[PDB]
């Protein structure tokens, strides 16, 4: 049986009266690098587990995808990342909602799965799990962009 | 929000989402993305899933174990599992949204009620294929 | 935790689940008690649900869910859904606890793998059981 | 008719070699109460919903139940609260987790259900949205019961 993935960048109101075609290629090629990289590693024989992984790392490092960088802004003007893994060989599972200060909430996720009993880690707990671990501690502005936060202020 | 789902040369299943919610939610909020079953599920026995839209309708609905039970118990395949999920039970609770899912087959479905969602899929060593728009 | 599953005169359903979590638990874990489809479970069509035990196990196997959908798209009766979910798959992943159900023709059915279960029902207009043991 | 409640008071716990009759007799009590209440609700009329809201929110009252008071201790010496709660006939849920400073989560799971567009929220921005609608804020020691804490350093 062949090796296959599949990616998505979110489903919504995506209007092609409002968009060129030069506008839609920079979302095409981002999607393309991405699901080229996943197939690649396949191909390889790497793990379903870290395919998914790495292409959901490259969607969050993204700016033009609402997860990582990029991501939407609460009503306070913040960003609160959520995330989720699950390895259907095992049905083990790893997530991670409400962090602000982990740089790729789906790695944050991983790191719950593999080093700890848990499925599921919140907020300021999860963040410190996940630095008792070596993960890095950032700030929550490297997730903003313009983009996203006119769109919060036309939301208002 | 944004996701991945993957079957290995191994025959592995597995999933992952992750996300910044929705543009102006309260503080606090948790939609389906980190949530097992709701926004994310894997298992060899049957599907793949990853899905993104109206959160809290996905929760409600438990979109992605969905699938999985209807394959499962249900007998459906990948294509009538996301039909029924995606365009007839979602739009009935008031929800808009998509997934992407691969079976433990390899069959793979990327449906979505809404305008777009932003997609791609391929098979290893084939050239893979991208959308934005309605099929 | 606990919890409490009923179905009413009009024949609706109902569940809620509510718990401290676990002595000297890791802050910020959460178990399956406050995830829909995992600790908590109500749809007029089929069952609800409260469950109680490993958490990780309830999240991993979404038993909440699992018990409506293998009555729904099964076809399982209530207690041999029970007995699937608590005696047979939740064990085979390491969890022990146990549920409360109430099927949308008033059965009802309070199955656990443990030594007991705190645990209590009633039929309207009867004089209620309790129990902390198994028999 | 059909109308029936089941609660439970959680399972795993419970060891008849380590317990006496007179301990058995106080929970055999004080479920028989709380059933009772949901029985005689039932019986009136009142909703499935409103049944489950009352049965939980007794259980969370009650010590002996890790609930509400009576909550067991996380490794910090303090409580973190989590509830759901759900309405079969409309498909509706609410839930909150992490919560430290709300008497009766479920009564604050129901809040979320009832008063904000959303399922589940965790955290002090439950704690926030919840103030914001007029629920009370208690001290976090108030669940608090040297049963629980003794557990907590023979734990240790
Ligand atoms: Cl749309
Ligand atoms: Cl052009
Ligand atoms: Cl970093
Ligand atoms: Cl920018
Ligand atoms: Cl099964
Ligand atoms: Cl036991
Ligand atoms: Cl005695
Ligand atoms: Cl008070
Ligand atoms: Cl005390
Ligand atoms: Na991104
Ligand atoms: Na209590």
């Given at each position: 049986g062949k090796a296959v993935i599949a990616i998505h960048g979110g489903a919504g109101a995506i209007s092609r009266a409002q968009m060129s075609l030069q506008q839609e290629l920079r979302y095409i090629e981002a999607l393309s690098a991405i699901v080229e990289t996943g197939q690649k590693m396949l191909e390889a024989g790497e793990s379903a587990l870290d395919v998914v992984t790495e292409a959901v790392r490259l969607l969050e490092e993204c700016?033009?995808?609402?997860?990582?960088?990029?991501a939407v802004f609460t009503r306070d003007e913040t960003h609160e990342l959520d995330a989720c893994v699950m390895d259907g060989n095992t049905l083990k599972a790893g997530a991670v909602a409400?962090?602000?200060?982990?740089?790729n909430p789906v790695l944050a996720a991983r790191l719950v799965m593999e080093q700890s009993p848990h499925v599921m880690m919140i907020g300021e707990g999860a963040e410190n799990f996940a630095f008792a671990r070596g993960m890095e501690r950032v700030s929550?502005?490297?997730?903003?962009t313009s983009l996203r936060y006119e769109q919060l202020l036309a939301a208002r | 929000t944004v996701g991945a789902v993957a079957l290995d040369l191994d025959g592995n299943l597995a999933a992952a989402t992750s996300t910044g919610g929705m543009?102006?939610?309260?503080?606090?909020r948790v939609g389906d993305s980190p949530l097992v079953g709701a926004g994310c599920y894997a298992n060899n026995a049957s599907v793949a899933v990853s899905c993104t839209g109206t959160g809290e309708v996905f929760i409600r609905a438990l979109a992605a174990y969905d699938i999985a039970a209807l394959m499962?118990?249900?007998?459906?395949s990948l294509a009538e599992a996301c039909e029924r999920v995606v365009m007839e039970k979602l739009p009935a609770l008031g929800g808009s949204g998509g997934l992407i899912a691969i079976d433990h087959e390899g069959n793979v479905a990327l449906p979505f009620?809404?305008?777009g969602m932003y997609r791609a899929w391929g098979y290893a060593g084939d050239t893979p294929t991208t959308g934005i728009y309605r099929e």
């Open positions: 700016p033009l995808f609402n997860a990582g960088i990029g409400g962090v602000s200060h982990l740089r929550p502005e490297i997730f903003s | 543009t102006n939610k309260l503080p606090g499962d118990y249900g007998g459906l009620n809404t305008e």
